[model samples]
Target: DSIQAEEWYFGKITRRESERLLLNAENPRGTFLVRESETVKGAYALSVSDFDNAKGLNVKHYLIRKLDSGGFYITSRTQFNSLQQLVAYYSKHADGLSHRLTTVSPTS
Candidate 1:
């Protein structure tokens, strides 16, 4: 398991369950995790806990889509060779998302 990957991937947990994990009281804004798609093959989902002054949006689900370049991207304009790279890039900057993925994915 020396892939240099991360603890962000959460297998096949359902959408609702990811919310439960990411939106729990202890998890703060920008907390996120990647999960296997609920219905599609090859595609994955990114769930993040978010807030914007007036309460919070709870969570946002994004699609990690594949490209003809054989890479992955949550936003086509910002493609990366792998999910880990994509996650790493977003972790540093929010780009178009609500916030930078600065918080660690919540514990199971």
Candidate 2:
């Protein structure tokens, strides 16, 4: 069980899907697994590149998912819906004082 707490890994992707996953550390540290059901109407709201390097998008917190449709979903948790929102949010909080979550993979 202790090993599970420190070691992890995940696969890489190139296609698309409704739910997806995100990594903040190296998968071994911690991670966020996001998904969309009928319960989540915005499953179809994001694109592939958005999931790829979204961390570099400069948002404080992101919602990443792994979909029932077979791929992933990644969104910035902000009040606005445009990329400008990401820029604005980052500009105001460049100290990165928001939630700092670590990404992880299923290990052990």
Candidate 3:
């Protein structure tokens, strides 16, 4: 079912095209997705996806995000500089923390 779902979402589209679709999908729950972009540095996109096929987005990029604010809090509310760092933090700390949180944008 995971593979089937991914196929439905991506469906042989290019990464650029898929990213466009993801951005357009309107993630009202604050889910996030990460992908390497040639145009933007340290850019993270808001997105939603199931966990089973998350790595499937790894052909040339990676995709991972919180299921919701509740899911994000369970990870200790740590800020990550990169996707690998985010995963590493959660991997070492299996214990989940639940709380309210906020997201701040760094001003240039």
The root-mean-square deviation over C-alpha atoms between each candidate and the true structure, in angstroms, is: 2.3, 14.2, 14.7
Least accurate 10 contiguous residues by lDDT in model 2: 2-11
Pairs that collide, model 3:
none
* Top-down TM-score ranking: 1, 3, 2
lDDT of 1: 0.82
With candidate 3 superimposed using the best TM-score fit, by how many Å does residue 1's alpha carbon deviate from the native? 4.4
What lDDT score belongs to each candidate, Candidate 1 first? 0.82, 0.30, 0.32
29-71 per-residue lDDT for model 3 (tens digits): 2223333333334233322322224443211233333343323
After best superposition, candidate 2 residue 28: deviation in angstroms? 7.1
lDDT of 2 by residue, 21-49 (tens): 33223242223222222334443222111
lDDT of 3: 0.32
Writing each residue's lDDT as its tens digit, candidate 1 over 1-108 gives 321356888877899999888887677788999888886677888889997678755888888887766888887778888888888898888898888887777677
TM-score attained by model 2: 0.22
State the weakest 10-residue window (summed lDDT) of model 1. Answer: 1-10
TM-score of model number 3: 0.24
Q: Hey, what RMSD does candidate 3 come out at?
A: 14.7
Listed in order, each prediction's TM-score against the native is: 0.85, 0.22, 0.24
- For model 1 the local lDDT of residue 91 reads 86
Error of 2 at 62 (Å): 9.5
